[PDB]
From Swiss-Prot, chain A:
Gene source species: Sulfolobus acidocaldarius (strain ATCC 33909 / DSM 639 / JCM 8929 / NBRC 15157 / NCIMB 11770)
GO biological process, one term: translation
Keyword Lipid biosynthesis: no
Protein name per UniProt: Large ribosomal subunit protein uL29
Metal-binding as UniProt keyword: no
InterPro entries: Ribosomal_uL29, Ribosomal_uL29_CS, Ribosomal_uL29_sf
Keyword annotations of the record: Ribonucleoprotein, Ribosomal protein
Secretion signal, residue range per the UniProt entry: none
Phylogenetic classification of the source organism: Archaea, Thermoproteota, Thermoprotei, Sulfolobales, Sulfolobaceae
Swiss-Prot record, chain B:
SUPFAM superfamilies in the record: Ribosomal proteins S24e, L23 and L15e
Gene3D superfamilies, A to Z: 3.30.70.330
Subunit structure: Part of the 50S ribosomal subunit. Contacts protein L29.
Presence of keyword Nucleotide-binding: no
Protein name stated in the entry: Large ribosomal subunit protein uL23
Gene Ontology cellular component annotations, sorted alphabetically: ribonucleoprotein complex; ribosome
Function: Binds to 23S rRNA. One of the proteins that surrounds the polypeptide exit tunnel on the outside of the ribosome.
GO biological process: translation
Annotated gene: rpl23
InterPro entries recorded: Nucleotide-bd_a/b_plait_sf (IPR012677), Ribosomal_uL23 (IPR019985), Ribosomal_uL23-like (IPR013025), Ribosomal_uL23/eL15/eS24_sf (IPR012678), Ribosomal_uL23_CS (IPR001014)
Swiss-Prot record, chain C:
Domain of life (superkingdom): Archaea
Species whose genome carries this gene: Sulfolobus acidocaldarius (strain ATCC 33909 / DSM 639 / JCM 8929 / NBRC 15157 / NCIMB 11770)
GO biological-process terms attached to the record: translation
Function: One of two assembly initiator proteins, it binds directly to the 5'-end of the 23S rRNA, where it nucleates assembly of the 50S subunit.
UniProt-listed SMART domains: KOW
PANTHER family noted in UniProt: 60S RIBOSOMAL PROTEIN L26 FAMILY MEMBER
Protein name (record): Large ribosomal subunit protein uL24
Gene Ontology molecular function: any one: rRNA binding
InterPro entries referenced in this protein's UniProt entry, alphabetically: KOW, Rib_uL2_dom2, Ribosomal_uL24_euk/arc, Ribosomal_uL24_KOW, Translation_prot_SH3-like_sf
Assembly with partners or alone: Part of the 50S ribosomal subunit.
Annotated keywords: Ribonucleoprotein, Ribosomal protein, RNA-binding, rRNA-binding
GO cellular component, one term: large ribosomal subunit
Protein family membership: Belongs to the universal ribosomal protein uL24 family.
Amino acid sequence: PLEVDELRKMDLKQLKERLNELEMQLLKLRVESRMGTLKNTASIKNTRKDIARILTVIGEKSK
Amino acid sequence: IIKEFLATEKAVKLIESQNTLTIIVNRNTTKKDIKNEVEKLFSVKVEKINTLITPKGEKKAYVKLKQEYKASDVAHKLGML
Amino acid sequence: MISSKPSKQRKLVYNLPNHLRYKLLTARLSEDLEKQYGIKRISIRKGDSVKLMRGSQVGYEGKVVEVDRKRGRVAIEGLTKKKADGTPVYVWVHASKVIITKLDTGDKERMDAIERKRKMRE
RNA sequence: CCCCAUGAAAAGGGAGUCUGGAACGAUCCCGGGAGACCGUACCUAGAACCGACACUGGUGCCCGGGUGAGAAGCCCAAG
RNA sequence: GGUGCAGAUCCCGGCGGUAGUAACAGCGAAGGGGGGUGAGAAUCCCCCUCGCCGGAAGGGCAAGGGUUUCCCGGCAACGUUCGUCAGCCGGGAGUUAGCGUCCUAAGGUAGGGCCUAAUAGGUACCUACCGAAAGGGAAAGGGGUUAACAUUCCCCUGCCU
RNA sequence: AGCAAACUAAGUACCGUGAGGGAAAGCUGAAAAGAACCCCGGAAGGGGGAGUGCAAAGAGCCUGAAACCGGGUGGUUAUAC
RNA sequence: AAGCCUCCCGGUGGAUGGCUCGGCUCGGGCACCGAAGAAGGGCGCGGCAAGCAGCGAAAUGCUCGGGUGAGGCGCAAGCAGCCGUUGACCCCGAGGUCCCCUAAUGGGAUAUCCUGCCGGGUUUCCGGCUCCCGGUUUAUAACUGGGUGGGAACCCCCCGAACGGAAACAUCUUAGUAGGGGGAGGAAAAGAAAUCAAUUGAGAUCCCCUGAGUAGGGGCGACCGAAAGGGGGACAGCCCAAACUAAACCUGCCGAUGAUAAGUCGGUGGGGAUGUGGUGUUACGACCUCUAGCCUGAGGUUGACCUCGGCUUUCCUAACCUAUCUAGCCGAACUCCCCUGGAACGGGGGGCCAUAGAGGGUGAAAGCCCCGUAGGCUAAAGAUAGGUGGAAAGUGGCUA
């Protein structure tokens, strides 16, 4: 999943938990430190890259 | 902010033996409460926490739960068991 | 104005930045290609086919299946040298000794690059 | 008992006395709540420190019986 | 034209001979038998016995080293021999405190000022602060549990602010 | 040699309590085609045999001298430099 | 029996020979960064991640445009997986984030770490806290608003060495160099003569070549050592104090206007007669004032005078246009025949472009196989330069 534009579309209140809900499942992927043996290594990069974006898009809304 | 759920052979007993959790967080070098982090992320009361400074560069904390919250469940919800 | 010392020149081709790699891929088309396209040389893309003029296997026609963009050489199917085990590995032949035979008109973004080269109408 | 040597100072505590204040009110007990951050593994040296080394050199510190004044020597306890 | 080399107790790299020679003694330790593992055993492991130390080769504690701790698998070197073994190599794990931080001596500093041409210079004066893991300094122990650390985790008794 | 530096990190490892001093080290062929496979050993890019490839001096990989040492070729020795 | 010598073969070392994404010199361009947090370090950061490099908890890259155009996921080939045609990766520009120490400045440091006080919203958290300049409020309380360090060499200015040389050595010299301290910028310094020289001349300074080891200095010892003039380069020259005008003055904020600029306007606060602003600073004089005389387009006044014109100086940069720089792009001619060769980029034959035969690559020594080359072309968005714009002040000339 690569969300790119709808972040700019709608309100900022929801993206807080949208950040949170992503943040939680980041932990879920973070079980790999035990050799989680999770299939999608790129998910972390997918997770890590996108999480910053919404954490960046908020500035465009002059937070 | 919470970063990972450690799963060493040492840890697994603790979540069973004492219903604790081995969680390592940022090295924020300032804490009053790693406590109130969990419940807004897991809805669990806290009974005690402590401080660890591992030589590998992380900051470990033994957090134990009151008996009303069986720590194995949330871990199973997380998904290592 | 660019220098002519051998050393500096070789540095570019050993350090080719990514958006310039087409340079070591472009190969000569055929007459029939330029007959309806009005163009001499163009960069290679996948999904194409080529013919060969130099090397021990001169005179082959295959399909553009493999490529080495960073250093600039390609490969075509139906042409392999068996390893000791018996699995095939792709023969590596440079664009420098090849002639293209056909291209893929299914991109609409490679197409306009063809167009902008002053080729006549369509 | 000795001194032509007279043998450290703060913070921190506790008490005493006098002034002002409000009447509620504890240095009592009873119930409740909390108590940053960081040190914390191992080795202390005839192999873990230094002396270029798995070095008879130095750097430490402290602590069973009998025989025997004995921490002397001997042997044997713990190890 | 950096220009022709045997040296300069030349420099650097390689390898000679003395050569399998010295040494692997000397400071009061010492092993033996049987079994096991593994290719390979004086050297590693199991059993028994035996000798030595025993105000130290024992026990617990620093500054320092920084993983030297533990588990699992290994031996080309690394070990003064060997080596299945190790502080060695390779794959993983591991220190929790309501029961140092505070103050201060030797002194020191930083500033204000007294000089120095200037200063990263000295500074008698004043002010602010640093200065002890053996100085002083509130308060807990007991038992019990992991291979690995514990007055810290489990239980009881507490205790101090 | 070229500035120390062309290399997996060079002011890096390191020697020094300290100001500081200060290294060594390039080349497989074009394409790893890196010897599948069979025998020895436990193993070692180790042996042998096969195979790739113009060529294998095929990982310690261009070419490969001497000091050296070993096998052999040719002379040649225990009354003697 | 040792061997001995030489030679063939092998291993042991790697010089030779060859190759080079490296340095080295030159010339030419370019040539400050910093409290909005530097340079310099310390830490982290990827699926499996050690160093470098890059990156800053928004950690192998976040956003937006511009170019680019089919693969990308560094150094660096593995397992596994993903991004990419809804335009990737890359490159350009604009942003966003941007930990800790660090001149580090809330306070403290033998801790790259701990720790307060206010104000803000408030969950995370955010702003401010040595020495000064000018303001608020009491005349000491806090509060409004803006000099520190680094940078390869270079530059300026103070302090200031011995070694040696004199075949000794003490004066002298080596020498204001080595070095110390302060302080800048991209250049610095200096810069308008109390200059020279000499037959009445030249005309800021600086550097280059000469003048010239000349002048001149010193146990007259080693040695040191000009100027003037000439010849070259670019050659630019304006403000202050005074005489004399005398509040006609400068400046903070807010609001309006003005393109947001400057300026003007209304209110505001400050500074100022112990002097702001106006003209003006030069030598056989200059300048100012007064007197007298002659001398501007409109108006007025009494040949004469005055007010409003153009002009000089200064300040302000905007939207637009032009050019230049950051980017990619166009860009000729054979892979024709025979032979050798693993490969033709070789040998022979054959044909051609050239304003492009610098150069590099591709299985070798290729103008015509590929790039590039001579020549020409590219902009959203920025940056630079010029024009196009606006405003303020000071305003006759000559003569005695």
